[PDB]
Chains A and B, each alone.
Chain A
Amino acid sequence: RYPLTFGWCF
């Protein structure tokens, strides 16, 4: 399952 990218913003 592809990662849930909440907060991944630089």
Chain B
Amino acid sequence: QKVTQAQSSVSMPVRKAVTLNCLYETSWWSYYIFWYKQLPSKEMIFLIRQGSDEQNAKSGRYSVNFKKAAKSVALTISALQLEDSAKYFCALGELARSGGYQKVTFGTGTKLQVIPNIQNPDPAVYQLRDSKSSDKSVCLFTDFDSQTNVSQSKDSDVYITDKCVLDMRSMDFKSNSAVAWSNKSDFACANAFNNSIIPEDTFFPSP
């Protein structure tokens, strides 16, 4: 209630711009708002700050739309990048009643997921064998674009990880991929990801 971030989660296409909302409650007439970005490493890095008497803060791709009457201080980041993906935190800063320090209060955070633009999909499911044990293998669903969604399986001892993007930076090449594995003898790459809706033109290589 002191700081309110209604959005638990937000998604947006790379290269586009997103707005992370923030409302706050204060009986102080002078105060500061701070925006932080929490990396997946859990590292909390400072972004931009807004003072109650200052024009709209702006710093690189970050900008704040200070709406003082409404007590609204939404953060906006433009020209999204894949690494923009993180959890964003809004904070209120008030000089304490003791005058001894600034009391900063944090909102609960909003997870921003920036969505890769896969321009050259080649959806396929491959089978990869253990470097040490030929028989042991794993199924790799990969090269689908961001419209594809990976569901868990009907089975409880069939394991499926959600899609995540990788960046072959030097080749300016991105690719999605999910992994699946099982001890079930009836487990096969042919039927691994078929509890998900996959592109009909998905390549299922022979053997």
Instruction: Give chain B residues whose Cβ lies under 8 Å from the Cβ of A4.
Output: 30, 95
Judged by DSSP, the binding face of A is: loop
Closest to A2 in B: B30
Which positions in A face B, CB cutoff 8 Å? Answer: 1, 4
Give the distance in Å from the alpha carbon of A1 to the alpha carbon of B30 in the complex. 9
* Chain A proximity of B92: nearest CB distance (Å): 15
Interface size on B, residues (CB 8 A): 3
* 0/1 interface trace, chain B 1-45, chain A, CB 8 Å (1 if under): 000000000000000000000000000011000000000000000
Chain A residues whose C-beta falls within 8 Å of the C-beta of B29 in the assembled complex: 1
What are 4 A-B interface contacts by the 8 Å CB criterion? Answer: A1-B29, A1-B30, A4-B30, A4-B95
Pairs A-B, 4 closest by C-beta atoms: A4-B30, A1-B29, A4-B95, A1-B30
Chain A neighbourhood of B30, CB < 8 A: 1, 4
Min CB–CB distance A6 → chain B (angstroms):
8
Minimum CB distance partner of A3 in chain B: B30
Task: Say how far A7's CB is from chain B's closest CB, in angstroms.
Answer: 12
Contacts of A1 in B (CB 8 A): 29-30
Q: How far is the CB of B49 from chain A (nearest CB, A)?
A: 12
B53's nearest neighbour on chain A, judged by CB, is: A4
Alpha-carbon gap, A8 to B95, bound state (A):
14
In the assembled complex, the Cα of A9 lies from the Cα of B95 at a distance in Å of 16
Q: Chain A's nearest CB lies how many Å from the CB of B30?
A: 5
Q: How long is the Cα–Cα vector from A1 to B52 in the complex, in angstroms? A: 14
* Interface membership of chain B positions 70-104, coded 1 if the CB is closer than 8 angstroms to chain A and 0 otherwise: 00000000000000000000000001000000000
**Closest beta carbon of chain A to B124's beta carbon, Å:** 59
A1 CB → nearest B CB, Å: 6
Give residues 31-67 of B contacting A (CB, 8 Å).
none
The CA of A1 and the CA of B29, in the complex, are separated in Å by 9
- Tell me the smallest distance from the CB of B98 to a CB of chain A, in Å: 14
| A4→B30 CA distance, assembly (Å) | 8
